[model samples]
Target: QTITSLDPNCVIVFNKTSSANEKSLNVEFKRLNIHSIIEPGHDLQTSYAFIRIHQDNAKPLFSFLQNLDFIESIIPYHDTELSDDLHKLISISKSKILEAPKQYELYNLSNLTNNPKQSLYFAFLQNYIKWLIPFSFFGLSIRFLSSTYSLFAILWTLSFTAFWLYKYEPFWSDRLSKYSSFSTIEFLVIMLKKCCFIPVALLFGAILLSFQLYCFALEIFIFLPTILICTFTPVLTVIYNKYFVEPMTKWENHSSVVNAKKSKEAKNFVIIFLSSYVPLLITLFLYLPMGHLLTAIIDTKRYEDQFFYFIVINQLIQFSMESEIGKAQLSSSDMKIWSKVKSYQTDPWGATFDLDANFKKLLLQFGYLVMFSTIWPLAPFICLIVNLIVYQVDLRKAVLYSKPEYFPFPIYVGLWNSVLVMFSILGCVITATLTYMYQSCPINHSWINIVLYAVFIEHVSVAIFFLFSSILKSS
Candidate 1:
């Protein structure tokens, strides 16, 4: 039997029974089937006390609560500062209970936004087609990297980083600016087509392939500083837009409300990305030197090696976390948890931001926390698999605690063409570096090789990021 309270927010259930000549007293419910319970509870009565309500299904929950015959009284509860006003409102509307907004109100705002079957089917088809591009590319990277030295992998990393920098916020801002002409449905269709058609078309284009290969070579050599510079490109652009671009646009009288917010969001994203990067810088400079120094004296790279291992692992994990497969697996298990979080309050758009932002955070945090410079061979990939699982679990927990808000601009940001440019550079770097490092002798490697490898790896990783971003849209 289901036991519920009149209070709408009461996710818990308590059962008390009356006995002969004894008053009703509270009792434990130790044996309740917890799988059926969405929210956890303490000891409850096995015979008479159990709570059953799917947090997602409020209508049925309300009905269940209303139909309960054993409850003595009903009360509304909320834990937020807004709870007091809501409680007062409920009390004032006691006789007209239907007039009061309940937990259902908050839940319905998200649940009612789409047609489930249609959207789900579309998402499924989208994800399937979307997965092809990155998954195929991922295979390419894995095979190419596996064929080479760790330095070659480093070059791939640099290229990916550069790609991320060039396209980052700018791409999304452009998408948002164009949002006025596209409905959500239309946008989804556009994304679906883009994911399926564009890459395949490019693969068949000889010029694009040749150009990509040429750039891939540069990614390993000349693009070293370029990749580093690109890391700050998005933030620099935001500063330019705010101090120059926006003011000039205003002077031209061409700025609109939609573009204004998109620009502002682009600015915010830069700030978020920068904040996340600060720790990375500290870890790289301050902590890394100490690790290196200790390893130099130790006669083995164990300390430094383990530290750097984590960095590569973190990079891989973060990269995967931002991928379509990573996102699909994560959201499928913990969308509800994320939906309740403040950062995700924005629903579709906020969800988008949170997804990217959190992935970045994971990169910064784990990249720093992990010791990478120690042993370089298989450590990175080993960390890669472990980090993927760790991040997924951590993300699940983060979602439950996040508050919801709205930020629709990032939706478009994820689809920016600049991202395409960056990814192309990354693919080039990985392919080129793998070709070089995997073939060269250890004695032939130089600082120049290291720099080239760094550029390539960074840019390629960035490209892979958007590749997944596109895949997520399709999904």
Candidate 2:
């Protein structure tokens, strides 16, 4: 069913000339048998009220409200279910709700009429300093490294440290909070759900290893953990709910079940699962079966070994971090009686930042585009298409099924900006190494020469990032 089909109520935004008109509006609503309120803290200079009337009555109310002298406009409030709920629960006026600006609005040339040369220069310098200094230091270290293996070891350590700090640590915290008191049976069930992907990944890795395609093995290692976590979490969630949660909290009626928030949680899990896996599935299809076709057209074997090693080491580092976290949690926690199941009335689903998961997927896509796109040029386009579809489905799920919670809009890009910069620097290094290995450059470069070339590539990449940023800002 379509998203609009899910909600039967109609919300009308009524703009008034002053707060004095609020009482009149309320009286009018009561006279018309409409459920309405003067939106809280709406000002005297200008204000609006949200009127929730039956869908069938919307047209009549719209016509009536628009003709009133004090009424500025009567517009339909076409927003997500969560948004609607938030408006009602918090008494927030429609004017306070922030909506994403259109793409054209973002690039409107007319908006760039500022005259602040000093500030602009400072901004540019700040960004340059942020991008260059750390990466340059890293480039110097790469140059001094005695061997490729030593470089790999260092990169592996760095990547593992990042994985532990960012991914596995948070994962363990969430798991511990949710599963710390799980029964032995429940724990085993959870383990079965999580470990289901391990066998599949291991088998895939073993197959590649047997074929003497160590590169493929490494790729699989990198790809497996993400795929499993992203795709299988929902399946595991569903299984747990069906076998454990449902029986534990057996509600008396449909309304009780709905109010309990289990369905919303389930819907979110499915949405996240779909969003996480579709790109991976597309990537695998392109690289596995269609990879030979691309190789036949253009020889990529020269780049494969190095690329494989880079990816494999990256994967192993992350895997090792995750494994360490899992072991620690297992060893530290003692078996206890299962926590008592609470009714939904007292235990409503809490607000969550689904953007965290989305960001990971975005970073993974960036990694694919930057690191692997040379081999599979169509990967970016495939990811773009899949992401478009995935987010639309996610939007629908959020609007139609998921529970509403206050999600604060971010003023800055925050960690994502730093993450992109780091990835870009790493991308340049990988690309430069591959080029040197392939003898694409004019000079028969020594290791020192390769390091210098890498530094040059890093600067160029940073410059490109600035160029894009400037264009985007100006546009």
Identify the candidate with maximal TM-score. 2
- Candidate 2: count of backbone clashes, pairs at least 3 residues apart or interchain: 0
Name model 2 segments beyond 4 Å from true: 1-353, 406-412, 439-444, 467-475
The TM-scores of all predictions, comma-separated, are 0.29, 0.32
Model 1: residue 64 alpha-carbon error in angstroms: 33
Give per-residue lDDT, candidate 2, residue 238. Answer: 48
* Per-residue accuracy of model 1 over 331-434 as CA lDDT, tens digit each: 43233322233223224432332333443443344233222212234444444444445433432332222222211112223322342343344334434544
lDDT of 1 at 130: 30
- Cα lDDT tens digits, model 2, 1-475, are 2213323133223334444545464436444665553322123343334445444443455455444534432222334453455334223222332322122321221112111211122222222223223333444455466234324322432343244334433443453333222111111023343334345434433442333333334444554543434334335444644654444334322334323344333333333333333323333323433543455433354245434433443334234322322332322211010000111112222112233334444454455445543334344445444444443333333332332221111100234445555665565455455545543432345558667876886676666555555544453
Query: What TM-score does structure 1 among the candidates reach?
Result: 0.29
